[PDB]
Design an enzyme around this catalytic site. Structure first.
Site, short mmCIF file in Angstrom:
data_model
loop_
_atom_site.label_atom_id
_atom_site.label_comp_id
_atom_site.label_asym_id
_atom_site.label_seq_id
_atom_site.Cartn_x
_atom_site.Cartn_y
_atom_site.Cartn_z
N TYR A 158 0.81 -1.22 0.00
CA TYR A 158 0.00 0.00 0.00
C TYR A 158 0.84 1.28 0.00
O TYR A 158 0.51 2.24 0.71
CB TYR A 158 -0.97 0.02 1.19
N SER A 211 -0.84 -7.28 9.19
CA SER A 211 -1.70 -7.82 8.13
C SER A 211 -0.93 -8.39 6.95
O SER A 211 -0.21 -9.38 7.09
CB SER A 211 -2.71 -6.77 7.65
N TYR A 212 -1.09 -7.78 5.77
CA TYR A 212 -0.32 -8.18 4.60
C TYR A 212 1.17 -7.96 4.88
O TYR A 212 2.02 -8.72 4.41
CB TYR A 212 -0.75 -7.37 3.37
N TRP A 253 -11.42 -6.18 0.14
CA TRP A 253 -10.00 -6.03 -0.14
C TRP A 253 -9.71 -5.80 -1.62
O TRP A 253 -8.99 -4.86 -1.98
CB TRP A 253 -9.22 -7.24 0.37
N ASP A 276 -10.15 -9.77 15.24
CA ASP A 276 -9.44 -9.58 13.98
C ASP A 276 -9.59 -10.81 13.08
O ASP A 276 -9.52 -11.95 13.57
CB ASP A 276 -7.96 -9.29 14.23
N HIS A 295 -9.92 -5.51 12.84
CA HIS A 295 -8.94 -5.03 11.87
C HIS A 295 -8.96 -3.51 11.72
O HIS A 295 -7.92 -2.87 11.64
CB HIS A 295 -9.16 -5.72 10.53
#
Lengths: 571, 571
Positions: free
Chosen positions: A41, A114-115, A163, A256, A284
């Site tokens: 991101y 997360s990612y 997403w 989450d 999240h």
């Protein structure tokens, strides 16, 4: 305390494609320990994710170098973007590159959420020696089990569409020269943002002319592979985690989407290296500790400075050989709901966890909250059954839990709006006079039967407050075709009674005196999970009109002791 | 794209005390334009505030230098901390210092939110030539009017105790060597955090053994000076704003505590320099655009990248002489609620604003939401009066609005929980068939009378949704002693009818067809405002037991046309 930042340093991968990084390097005489973050991101946009992580500039002031990388095919990086598939190789080549630079002292670590957490597990399995520690927050080592599907074999449709649309919007906004059809594509993407349940509501699900065009992986990989097959195992890290000896500082949240898998990573690495666990009451998109009908207190707000201190102690121990750096730091730190307090533990699962059966029962029908469903530590003396109609056209709406994009800011959601549904069966203990602590993994064993050759079963654990609030804790689902295996589904015979396990992930909650423990059983939870067609067909390809309703049944009594398994803690 | 960061550079003030700064400086041949941020919450902790501001590292990559400063007596800075009083002089000396450095090209700007916004107005009035532009977000130029008291002359008690406790916790957490009594002091501070209404509930209010010790200014300045006297004018910037010719990029939120004063700053500077206005539907602690009972849509989320782009264009114009940088950028950009869309305007207030009276009326008593109170553009034909008992021991609870610390994350709060109170008078239009846009400053003129020699009157504008939700928009209060002036209060005669103005700040909302416009009138709004004792005494010094109840009355009809003034927009 001083440092410099170099932007868009291009790092070549094995295939020639170059990924872009930014280098935050301290004013140092020689080489320094290095921290790597792999981000899809925009590496430039540090403010967007860091508040959910650490005050990591503190690491740089303290002599660490930090490297933040655009993943392949995104922003300043060359190549083509496809989720997950290039990240093992790219991380390995990136670590190698870092270890070759003059400013690296040969010690590398990672951190991120997360990612940015998943990518650390993808890096760790490469076996690169210089990698001394990782800190994956709200991450997963099994992309099927989280966040795209789940242990129950249902599609996390709101997660997927939410997403994908976020990535779609990102691709359009980041484009050098805007295409003419961008604006039209955008409006569709913003519509998904404001109404994810609506986009998930279309049939057939697999028909996504927008998202499937902007990002084909949404269909080619996720929607088209409902079975945990080779395409999924290809990107799964979990089986290789046992062979690793890399310390991991693992952070999770009770609400989450990754919580189940985050906790499992800890269990899988704790015996081979220094693992640490921190679990807060967060979802999240909400780490404030404040929700619509549930306040956990100011101490429950994501403690970013305490996390920064712990990460730094963790890295000082493993990247700088500071043998005493983690003195006084607990192995496991949990936010225990109910009493609403942080508490230190020596292990996860907790030692002296009593995995205790609470049996379904009661006279009359357990349908709705005003039914007669009971929970008890004794086996129900009478053989009965509860029966409801599940109709895909009218699924049980999702309320809190581990929702990601569809109203994912209210984990401990009050369940009263769905209490009067006939397809929501309620079972609860009597009012408690003594506190009951439930802290650990939660699952249910249900004796079930259907009129259909496939259907779903859900179970949700709930804390009923004296004032009437029925607060969701953890929930799970089982897709009956996947009742024995997520790899080789077989259908079921209508009318036949099956004993099925429902993985309800985990929680930590003290049910205080005056409260009740409640379980809701149903056959849908939409759009947290896509709805079962009740046909045995390929669900994501079926038109709604072509789906069937199912008469589903929960059996309970001495011969079919359906029960929830609660991790009872007694101190 | 490259830069360096230098930490804890000490800058000497006129008195010898040195403030600490961090220097973010681009790799440049010569001097560069510079941006200054003055921060009381640790210059190191950039992540805590930046998400509510801009992606300002982009400024540094684009060739701006950024200077972030610990204010006097806080963190790495020397001296003693007292809010507001040292900030004019310290900012002036700091700007002077910056303008003397080799890396400054002689152009300086500022940006920041809240206290980081106020400090910019405090800097601007010094008349330093090198200061070319400021960007104060959610700020005020009159500390009395926001956030400590208000135009109505009531104390913003939840604002005061919430903030003071935040500063108290900050002082303890930042201490070099912890004092032994720290932990005890902390527990009290965390208790205030979790229950601000409770701390505000104590009588006498001025008795704060904790906060008054940790930060004496809370009593010595704020609580002890309920009148807008010399102590307040001493720190007020507003009257000097007219003499300025400094461009200002002003950001506000419809539910932000500073909104009234933020908007007024724009009106005060727009005629002398390039002013810009951006107003979103946010409160201080919630910029997501998502609230418990009101969703404004994904486009309402604080648009941080668009803000970054606008700030940069603003600075390029005024600090770098880029004459065309602000081409295409609107003067005023508002998020218009109801239609829930961003919209560009050429001025604030909007041109063609029709300041329209909506008269109170109706048959029977207007008490509660099920009463007969009406709103109409015609004068009520019948002389009547509505009457209620206001009892300080049972004030009307605050629900949304511009609350800061006490539940300040739910501005557009549903008002139904207080609709059945006898001391909440409701007046509403019939269901609308045509949209009515209310965008601008809002105020009420009420013909009132009391049994007491002082009391309060409140007015709240509400959008009633077809589904029953009664969403708060803007509200105001008048403390009767301050009905004519905040400087020289006189009491009132019991039974006498007064025409009083209630400043309800501002809003932008389209009341769609099917909705109603509603006004709630009462005599309390706690703890947004402290409660009037109804005695004429020194309110903050009175014990609750010693306060009186008041029989208050709203007069309405041809001889007493009480009305709300709505800024009607018609397009």
């Amino acid at each position: 305390g001083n440092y410099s930042v170099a932007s868009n340093v291009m790092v070549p991968m094995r295939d020639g494609v170059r990924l872009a990084v930014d280098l935050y390097r301290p004013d140092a005489d020689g080489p320094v320990p290095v921290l790597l973050v792999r981000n899809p991101y925009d590496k430039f946009d540090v403010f967007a994710w860091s508040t959910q992580s650490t005050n990591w500039l503190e690491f740089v002031r303290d002599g660490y170098a930090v490297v933040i990388q655009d993943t392949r095919g995104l922003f300043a990086s060359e190549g083509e973007f496809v989720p997950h598939v290039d990240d093992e190789a790219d991380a390995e080549d990136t670590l190698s590159w870092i270890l070759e630079q003059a400013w690296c002292d040969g010690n590398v670590g990672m951190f991120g959420v997360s990612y940015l957490g998943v990518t650390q597990w993808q890096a760790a399995v490469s076996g690169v020696g210089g990698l001394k520690a990782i800190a994956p927050s709200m991450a997963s080592a099994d992309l099927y089990r989280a966040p795209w599907y789940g242990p129950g074999g249902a599609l996390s449709v709101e997660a997927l569409l939410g997403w994908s649309a976020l990535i779609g919007r990102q691709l359009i906004t980041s484009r050098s020269d805007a295409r003419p059809e961008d604006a039209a594509d955008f409006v569709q993407l913003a519509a998904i943002c404001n109404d994810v349940a609506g986009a998930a509501s279309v049939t057939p699900l697999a028909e996504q002319p927008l998202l499937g065009r902007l990002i084909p992986w949404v269909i080619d990989q996720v929607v088209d592979h409902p079975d945990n097959d080779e395409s999924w195992q290809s990107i799964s890290l979990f089986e290789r985690l046992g062979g690793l000896a890399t310390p991991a500082l693992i952070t999770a949240g009770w609400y989450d989407g990754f919580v189940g898998e985050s906790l499992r990573t800890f269990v899988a690495v704790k015996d081979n290296a220094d693992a640490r666990l921190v679990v807060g009451p967060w979802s999240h998109s909400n780490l404030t500790g404040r929700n619509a009908d549930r306040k956990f207190g100011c101490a429950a707000t994501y403690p970013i400075q305490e996390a920064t201190t712990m990460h730094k102690a963790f890295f000082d121990r493993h990247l700088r050989g500071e043998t005493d750096a983690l003195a006084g730091v607990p192995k496991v730190r949990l936010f225990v709901m109910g009493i609403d307090e942080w508490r230190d533990e020596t292990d996860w699962p907790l030692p002296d966890t009593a995995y205790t059966p609470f049996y379904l029962g009661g006279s009359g029908a357990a349908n709705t909250s005003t039914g007669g469903g009971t929970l008890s530590t004794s086996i129900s003396g009478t053989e009965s059954a509860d029966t409801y109609l599940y109709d895909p056209a009218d699924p049980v709406p999702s309320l809190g839990g581990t929702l990601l994009f569809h109203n994912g800011d209210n984990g401990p959601a009050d369940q009263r709006p769905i209490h009067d549904r006939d397809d929501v069966l309620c079972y609860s203990t009597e009012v408690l006079t003594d506190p009951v602590e439930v802290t650990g993994t939660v699952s249910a064993r249900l004796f079930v039967s259907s009129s259909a050759v496939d259907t779903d079963f859900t179970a949700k654990l709930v804390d009923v407050f004296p004032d009437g609030r029925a607060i969701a804790l953890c929930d799970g689902i089982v897709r009956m075709r996947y009742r024995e295996t997520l790899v080789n589904p077989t259908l079921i015979e209508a009318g036949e009674i099956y004993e099925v396990a429902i993985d309800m992930l985990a929680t930590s909650n003290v049910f205080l005196p005056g409260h009740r423990i409640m379980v809701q059983v149903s056959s849908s939870n939409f759009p947290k999970y896509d709805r079962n067609s009740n046909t045995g067909g390929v669900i994501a390809r079926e038109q709604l009109e072509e789906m069937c309703t199912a008469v589903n049944r929960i059996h309970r009594g001495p011969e079919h002791p359906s029960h929830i398994v609660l991790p009872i803690i007694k101190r």
